[PDB]
Design a protein around this ligand. Sequence first.
Ligand code: HEM
Ligand code: HEM
Ligand SMILES: CCc1cc(CNC)cc(OCc2ccc3ccc(N)nc3c2)c1
Ligand SMILES: CCc1cc(CNC)cc(OCc2ccc3ccc(N)nc3c2)c1
Ligand SMILES: C[C@H](O)[C@H](O)[C@H]1CNc2nc(N)[nH]c(=O)c2N1
Ligand SMILES: C[C@H](O)[C@H](O)[C@H]1CNc2nc(N)[nH]c(=O)c2N1
Ligand SMILES: [Zn+2]
Lengths: 416, 409
Amino acid sequence: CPRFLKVKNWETEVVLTDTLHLKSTLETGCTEYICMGSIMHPSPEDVATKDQLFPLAKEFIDQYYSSIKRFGSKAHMERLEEVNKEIDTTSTYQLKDTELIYGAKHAWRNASRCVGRIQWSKLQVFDARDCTTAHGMFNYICNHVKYATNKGNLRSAITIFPQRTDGKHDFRVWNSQLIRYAGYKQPDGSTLGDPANVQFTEICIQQGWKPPRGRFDVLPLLLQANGNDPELFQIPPELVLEVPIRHPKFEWFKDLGLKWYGLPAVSNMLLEIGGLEFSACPFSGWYMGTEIGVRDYCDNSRYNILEEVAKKMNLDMRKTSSLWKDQALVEINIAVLYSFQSDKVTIVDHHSATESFIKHMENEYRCRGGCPADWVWIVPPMSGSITPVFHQEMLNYRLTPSFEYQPDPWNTHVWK
Amino acid sequence: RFLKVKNWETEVVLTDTLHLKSTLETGCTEYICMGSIMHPSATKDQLFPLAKEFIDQYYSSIKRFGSKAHMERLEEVNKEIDTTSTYQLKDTELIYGAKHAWRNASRCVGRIQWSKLQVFDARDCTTAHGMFNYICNHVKYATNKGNLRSAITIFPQRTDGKHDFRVWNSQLIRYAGYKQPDGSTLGDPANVQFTEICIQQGWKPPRGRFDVLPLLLQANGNDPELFQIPPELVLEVPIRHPKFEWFKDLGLKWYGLPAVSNMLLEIGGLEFSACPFSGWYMGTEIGVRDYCDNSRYNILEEVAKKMNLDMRKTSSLWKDQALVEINIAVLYSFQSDKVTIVDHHSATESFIKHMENEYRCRGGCPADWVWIVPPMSGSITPVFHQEMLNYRLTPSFEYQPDPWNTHVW
Ligand code: HEM
Ligand code: HEM
Ligand SMILES: CCc1cc(CNC)cc(OCc2ccc3ccc(N)nc3c2)c1
Ligand SMILES: CCc1cc(CNC)cc(OCc2ccc3ccc(N)nc3c2)c1
Ligand SMILES: C[C@H](O)[C@H](O)[C@H]1CNc2nc(N)[nH]c(=O)c2N1
Ligand SMILES: C[C@H](O)[C@H](O)[C@H]1CNc2nc(N)[nH]c(=O)c2N1
Ligand SMILES: [Zn+2]
């Protein structure tokens, strides 16, 4: 690799130099002969060995004391030694509260696919490593939801449960997000609610959940503690902020009966810190409008409302080149933004978000020597080229600590 | 190893074997992806193997791989490189190579058309007057009174590098751009530099919003020369809107024929520094990028004003609304004037079908998601949800430096 990699913005001519890539840790999937930049997941029940864990821990510890300007200090060398003794006698080790907080914040700072990272340092970290039961997990998650929601003034947060040990005692949240709507396949092949969540719903129903079988039913939490069978809990409905979707100009838009929930809370990723694995680490921010307005609502295999909206807009839907789809899409996204703002629930539009991300990325290049970014994900799902990120060259690479994908728990769980 | 790509909307999974045949680098490494970098990073000795590879895949394409004809061709090519340090492509080879440069263009969403390409062989050309003749004929043929036909014109190959043929225009047809005293730009800001060179070389500029630039043509490494395309060969479309009657009062128009003239065609180790090619427009090329890029004609604000939209807050999505209307106008204008054009829904749709074709008949299809996905309405087109492998096959179209940066007068 070269020491200096340069990226250009083609709209502003601004050029930035990246050195942070030298710190890259794992593989991207690309080679010199092929690029897998548009593959969603470019790639066993066993855990890190002693010898594998030593250098990963030391790497993170080094980076931590380096961040607080105490590199090579007595406390640094002592912490190294303590960590080394712990690994050597227990095959694992425990993070200090400060190290945990630093690690969580940096996994977010390092998330190449996140357009919201200007916020990374303002993450509230809830330490749930004392948790031992699913009831306890439920307590922590509820407290998380209430804090994060803040009566609509959303605050970003992460709750972190005990790290993996032997891989047979994992903590998992089986939900893909803390709050999602149920999806139900009908005998006639149609889907009620959210087609994205049909499989998870069927699992909940199997596990005992009695479904309301409506259009927007909040799923229960399915929580696994210490590798035991997962348990169902209903989130107190008052903890679940929702926004009915209406439109500034089209009075009929409310008649569509759409709503969405305020808190986006991904709960199925793995947080890796210093070689330690936190398989349950629900985190939440707030929405960019297109997440709801374009993807959740207008994806074909989601709520797929474009046609019904375009019909009420009395658009000519017979030719594609009338751009009836594009026209309808804009009005839906206007509605989503308008309804959140009206209800004073935090949300950010794709223009503001991408403009803040360019400012963030620049600052990162200046103060950090780079900012990994996944263009394929950073560019919004509509209006791409009228946002500043479209024209921005980016380098993608993996820094640690990081959020990682992990397989769905029902696929691996040994049922007791 | 065999690689799979998945469409997350349809769950269709295709298997790539074709990438195994690439040899050119993409710019990525195992540790760092550069998929969003616009431009990443001969001798007798080097030339023959490149030639061999091309001849090999040519005779393979006509199911005569290892034939007496094939062997004699290799030998003929070896002898020729020996006695001349280069070689000449057969007419068949030229046409094959040009179609496959298009076929291999990872960033082109229009490649379902790849084998319908009219190839004009201009390798006998010697002077800029000759290039001008060939280019007028190309333009006339490709334009076809609005029923556009894909075409490429191939001028003589690079020899010593001191004698290149170059079309200095980035496209055969483009509008001039002018740096104004007050500081602003009249016409196309993308072409301000090129416009200045034409003016400096003697072109008398109308100084309008849509002045068609002259051809600036360089033959055999000599100073480039100026030519006016006969106006009757330049097909243009006034942009109007099917609902907004005031839209025509914006005085917008564009040309029908998109004809990229600054790329380099490489075939079997040979480099064709002048190879203007044309097809037809996808509406967003004009309606989104040409018209609404901040650094281009930049008309979003004017349109939104006429639509009387609230422009005080960005969350009103006034930009997004205006953008769709401009693109409705562009498609509607071309279609009313019967000038070939494709919308991004239909084009991306075709491209998915084309991928399936290619995976089936060829074992893959190199594709650059960053370029294939349209500059608006990404996820409501099928390509958004389509995983793509990008890799570099040859024959190819490559970037090359602008010749004023290189030329000695
Ligand atoms: C605070 C406001 C935030 C905004 C506006 C935001 C925005 C986004 C958006 C729009 C995406 C793409 C979503 C998609 O297309 O599915 C994303 C991805 C992501 N974000 Fe953020 N985010 C925020 C907070 C956070 C926080 C607090 C974390 C972690 C602590 C985080 C970590 C991630 C990760 C790991 C991804 C990629 C996940 C994947 O690859 O599937 N984000 N973000
Ligand atoms: C026939 C109808 C065609 C359509 C609808 C079409 C469409 C497109 C579009 C929309 C782009 C992106 C351009 C941009 O964003 O600036 C593109 C790129 C490209 N096309 Fe096609 N195209 C067509 C024909 C052709 C032909 C005839 C050739 C060559 C023989 C060709 C070769 C290329 C190449 C090399 C690029 C990428 C240029 C670069 O990397 O900068 N295309 N095409
Ligand atoms: C593969 C698992 C997956 C798929 C998808 C598909 N997106 C439509 C999204 C995934 O995560 C998406 C994500 C992650 C973190 C976020 C934080 C804040 C926010 N507003 N949105 C987020 C959205 C994960
Ligand atoms: C990187 C150099 C470059 C930049 C840009 C900027 N796009 C707005 C476009 C470039 O080529 C753009 C191109 C090439 C071939 C085409 C063939 C047919 C067609 N309709 N459009 C094309 C468009 C090259
Ligand atoms: C930075 C980025 O690579 C650059 O802006 C690209 C993005 N995608 C594109 N896609 C197309 N079709 N055409 C372009 O010019 C670009 N520009
Ligand atoms: C095939 C492609 O990688 C996939 O559809 C990606 C494209 N870009 C995306 N970008 C974001 N922000 N979110 C997504 O889910 C996706 N999906
Ligand atoms: Zn790559």
